[model samples]
Target: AYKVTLKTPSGDKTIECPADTYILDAAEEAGLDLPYSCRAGACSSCAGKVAAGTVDQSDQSFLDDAQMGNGFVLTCVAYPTSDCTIQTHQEEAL
Candidate 1:
């Protein structure tokens, strides 16, 4: 499992998720209802900025290579690769 930290409008939250688990699922299990749409990596509603560590987004397809490099992640499909920190609910920020 990896430690994940989230910065949201309500407050910051921390949760643990297995390497194969999506960040969104982890957040939901942690009692966070973050914004989301499509839930399949085809949109940006679940977008978040990865402020700290790495995540495995091989299943994600919405953001381009450049945007992913810019820290944009489709949390619905993102899986923790390392203990990471993220800022959520900024669909327009990307």
Candidate 2:
């Protein structure tokens, strides 16, 4: 019944969300713990791949314009523009 379907190693996860609220917040509302550390979008802890629709991460954060262009989203600051699917727990390795 959730709009955003997230990919997690634990299993396939989905959580309800609205454009007004961040995806991670919705996950918390749904009692689903995705992944997150720094809620400022500065850390890639909640990094995920947008497989389906689009989202708005324009709230401001550490991701550069180039990084946001890769369809990657920081769920803590990301809000789905439409019902979307994403892969959670995915991040860039240093």
Candidate 3:
């Protein structure tokens, strides 16, 4: 089991999920609203910032190496490699 914290533009929410659970699953389980245009990670609608913590997206295909370095990860296909925190809701980005 692992813990993940998601900070929306509205508020911050946290959830406990299996190590293998995707970020979308964790957000939904936490009662936090998740933005997802394409659950497969093709759309940028689910893009978010990693306010804190590291994520492992080696198996995922949404984010590129540069985006990961910029603390950007597509929550649609992201899974927690370890404990993590991410900024959700892209209101500011828009």
Candidate 4:
């Protein structure tokens, strides 16, 4: 089991995500209005900071190497490598 934390414009919230669960999918299930333009990783609309932890990229476009290095990840294709927290609803990232 893995835990996912989302820091939204409203506040910080956490949810349990199965290893195979994508953060976007979990966010939807958890009822958060996480802005996203694509359910796939083709767009950066769902980009957020991966503040802590690593993620397995399901596709190359999930994130650029620089963003990964900067701790940002695309939730559409990210699978957690450990318990993690992300900055969602960020105006800069948005």
Candidate 5:
């Protein structure tokens, strides 16, 4: 499992996200309401900035090469590769 720390306007929350679990699912299970328009990665509503660590996500067309390079991740399909710190509520990429 990896530690996922989320920083939002409301407050900061930390939860454990397993390798087999998506970050959004894990956060939801933890009782944290992270924004998400679609459970799929097609939407950027769940986008957040990675302050630290890395993640691997599928269906990331919502984010461009520059956004990905800039540490943007779509939590809907994002799987943590290591302990991660994410600044949530970032504007949608699209």
Candidate 6:
């Protein structure tokens, strides 16, 4: 399991998630409100920036390589690979 930290308008929230668990599910379990549309990796509503640490999101296709290279991740499909700090409600470049 890895520790996932979320930066929200309310405040920063931390939670533990197994490698197989998605960050969105973990955040929801922690009672943090993260914007999300599809529970799958097909939407950008669950977009966020990886401020620190790493996550496994190779299957996510909503964001392009450049966006992913810039630390953008779809939390709905992102699984923690290491302790991660993420800023939620982020948008992709148009």
Top candidate when judged by TM-score against the true structure: 1
Q: Model 5: how far is 35 from its true place, Å?
A: 0.9
lDDT of 4: 0.80
Whole-structure CA lDDT of model 1? 0.92
Better model by lDDT, 3 or 5? 5
Better of 2 and 4 by TM-score: 4
Off by more than 4 A, model 1: none
lDDT of 2 by residue, 1-94 (tens): 3389877777877777877889888888887777789899787888888888888888657667776777778889988899899877777621
Q: What TM-score do all the candidates reach, one by one? A: 0.95, 0.84, 0.83, 0.88, 0.92, 0.92
The model with the greater lDDT, 2 or 3, is 2
Q: Kindly provide the TM-score of model 2 when superposed on the true structure, using C-alpha atoms.
A: 0.84
Tens-digit lDDT track for model 4 on 50-78?
78877776583756677778887788788
Candidate 4 lands at a TM-score of 0.88
| lDDT (0 to 1) per candidate | 0.92, 0.80, 0.74, 0.80, 0.87, 0.89
Over 47-90, each residue of candidate 1 has an lDDT whose tens digit, in order, gives 99999999998888789989988999999999999999999997
Residue 36 local lDDT, model 3: 80
Question: Global CA lDDT of candidate 2, please?
Answer: 0.80
lDDT string for model 6 (1-94, tens) is 7988898878888889999999999999888888899878998999999999999998897898988989999999999999999989896432
Best by lDDT, which number?
1
Candidate numbers sorted by TM-score from highest down: 1, 6, 5, 4, 2, 3
Clash count of each predicted structure: 0, 0, 0, 0, 0, 0
lDDT of 5 by residue, 1-94 (tens): 8999998888889899999899889999999888898777887889899999999986676888988889899988889999999988886443
Candidate 6 clashing pairs, residues 3+ apart or interchain: none
Across residues 1-94, which tens digit of lDDT does each residue of candidate 3 receive? Answer: 6678778768777788676778887787777778787677676778788877777656557566777788888777777777778888752462
